[PDB]
């Protein structure tokens, strides 16, 4: 299942409407936002294939920062090898369009908050964007939203040692969305089932 055409409703519930460009596939052009905070949810795949995995990009023109929150925190190389996904192009187009000097600071997550069998990627992205909308200079951590979940080194993604941390992250995610999204509340059971912690576990 995962999350489909749902993020929009949830992200709107979370107060991101004034900054949210929408959901895109891997062809996301980038940001043309020299003066305003902006963000987007971006799939690793093209629309042609259905959608594989969700990430969040956010742009702060005042701090000159582009944020990438991909819930597993994979390296660029692992994004290319696991998902055939490259964000160099959209980063370049964003900086050309949005920065007077054609430069930016890329800030990207290096830790996993999501279990390796979880289908909650899209929901984690929604949570990050609430953090961005409310704390645009420190969306990754040290803020009330992201203080609710704990990243672990991406190298330990499949370690039995950290699985309870990642399960608790998912519990906090859902409860976060219960508290802040009427859309989530009214679809609570269906979304939990379609995004569950062991949803993609191999049999």
């Amino acid at each position: 299942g995962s999350s489909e055409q749902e993020l929009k409703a949830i992200v709107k519930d979370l107060g991101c409407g004034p900054y949210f460009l929408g959901t895109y596939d891997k062809r996301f052009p980038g940001f043309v936002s020299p003066h305003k905070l902006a963000c987007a949810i971006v799939n690793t795949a093209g629309r042609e294939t259905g959608g594989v995995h969700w990430m969040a990009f956010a742009w702060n023109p005042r701090s000159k920062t582009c944020y990438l929150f991909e819930p597993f925190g994979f390296s660029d190389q692992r994004l290319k090898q696991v998902y055939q996904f490259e964000y160099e192009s959209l980063l370049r187009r964003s900086a050309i369009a949005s920065s007077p000097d054609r430069c930016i600071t890329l800030e990207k997550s290096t830790q996993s908050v999501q279990g390796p069998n979880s289908a909650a990627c899209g929901l984690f992205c929604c949570m990050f964007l609430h953090a961005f909308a409310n704390w645009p200079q420190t969306p990754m951590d040290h803020n009330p939203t992201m203080n609710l979940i704990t990243g672990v080194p991406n190298s330990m993604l499949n370690s039995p040692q950290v699985q309870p941390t990642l399960r608790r992250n998912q519990e906090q995610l859902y409860s976060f969305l219960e508290r802040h999204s009427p859309y989530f509340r009214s679809h609570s059971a269906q979304i939990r089932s379609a995004t569950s912690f062991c949803h993609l576990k191999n049999m």
Binding site: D101, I104, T105, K108, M140, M146
Partner: peptide, 11 residues
């Protein structure tokens, strides 16, 4: 939250 890496990029 998550730790993050920062990279200056110019195009």
């Amino acid at each position: 939250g998550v730790q993050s890496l920062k990279r200056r990029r110019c195009f």
